[PDB]
Design a binder for this molecule. Structure first.
Ligand SMILES: NC(=O)c1cn[nH]c1NCc1cccnc1
Ligand SMILES: NC(=O)c1cn[nH]c1NCc1cccnc1
Ligand SMILES: NC(=O)c1cn[nH]c1NCc1cccnc1
Ligand SMILES: [Zn+2]
Ligand SMILES: [Zn+2]
Ligand SMILES: [Zn+2]
Lengths: 153, 149, 158
């Protein structure tokens, strides 16, 4: 009954000449997210929520030589398990004015579920626009938010 | 002990010409939220948090005013096997003052979710004059929900 | 078995001539957060998450920004009083997680000290308190260093 909650936030700029990768899914689009990594904003938010729930700090405290964000999410899951926690569920929201993310959501859930060794019914991803407000509304970046529940076994 | 958490986000533009409805409450103001129906930013965030906790997707996958949608959301969460344990939320608006209307929103939300009043919370924040929120160009809501098998 | 979750959000402007105090830590910096109190954005977010989890409203309900008794108020004192009211309502705190978002200064060197302050104020062990530090990847007013934001989540049990 030693439950813990975590929350994660990430945002990346949208830039020309890079693939758009969110939740491990490559999405056709003229721009992609900027970062040292593949800049997977969704996977980063989830990673931080998981580190947060296990009180293990954040991505900056932990991170891998040219690794993509799925390898990092897998490693995050590893460190969470190492600290004696089991993951109960993940929920998240992606905020992007464009492109449409709906057709890709189930693939993202499947990717996250595989990376965390969770059944699909314990992983959720939601898609939002920013109603044309601010930098998200102008399509200058994409934000992700995440929440994670774990239990110390 | 099969608990799940969910989280929700919503924002709408604040424009002259529409009524301001937040948490089912019509609030007198020179401007209102722009959306498909009543643009109830608070109920939308809560609805998303509930679907998220149940891993049922989001508002767009499932879906009338926003209270009707919240009630249908709650029905679907119940059918998926989940009981709602609590909801917490924050509205971010530079104006008007929301404090007077909080109990009314909590009452509407608790009714729609068939929850005791003490399992529903709504908080109110300004954006300290920063950004589109701080300039009164929109209103944001954030929600968290805990459910159980 | 009566668990509840809460979430909190806060933002304050960054201005010259104010102490920069985040998570109870005075951080050397040429600007600080503007507010009625010491403007501790992180502690406020956590305070709101705790009040939210207990369904006790928000920091404005409990510690009004128009009340002169809270002018320059120590947000750690506010957080302890919040924790006291949450306990009085019948709740025990299980954990806190949080994020600070700031273009500058570097927060990594101060995070452990913030964690320790929050754990002290909530009478929790360090391993139930987490503070994460983020930039906004150069976007928006946060990217321009006009303010600093904090987010928090709390789990309690009645
Ligand atoms: N403290 C940290 O460095 C930190 C905390 N969370 N993520 C971090 N760094 C990696 C990063 C940076 C920017 C965007 N996405 C991921
Ligand atoms: N995927 C979705 O459509 C979606 C996810 N959450 N809400 C959605 N659409 C309804 C909506 C849209 C804009 C503002 N408020 C509510
Ligand atoms: N309802 C409220 O006033 C309220 C809800 N949360 N914080 C509030 N006011 C105090 C405050 C104000 C500005 C920055 N930080 C804290
Ligand atoms: Zn990132
Ligand atoms: Zn909406
Ligand atoms: Zn504050």
């Amino acid at each position: 009954m030693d439950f813990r909650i975590g929350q994660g936030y990430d945002v990346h700029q949208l830039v020309p000449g890079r693939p758009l990768i969110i939740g491990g899914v490559t999405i056709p689009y003229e721009r992609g997210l900027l970062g040292h990594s593949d800049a997977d904003v969704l996977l980063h938010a989830i990673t931080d929520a998981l580190f947060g729930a296990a009180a293990l700090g954040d991505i900056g405290r932990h991170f891998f030589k040219g690794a993509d964000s799925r390898a990092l999410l897998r490693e995050c899951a590893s460190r969470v398990a190492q600290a004696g926690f089991a993951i109960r569920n993940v929920d998240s929201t992606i905020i992007a004015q464009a492109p449409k993310l709906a057709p890709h959501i189930d693939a993202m859930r499947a990717n996250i579920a595989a990376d965390l060794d969770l059944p699909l019914d314990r992983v959720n991803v939601k898609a939002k626009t920013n109603e044309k407000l601010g930098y998200l509304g102008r399509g200058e970046g994409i934000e992700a938010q995440a929440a994670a529940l774990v239990v110390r076994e």
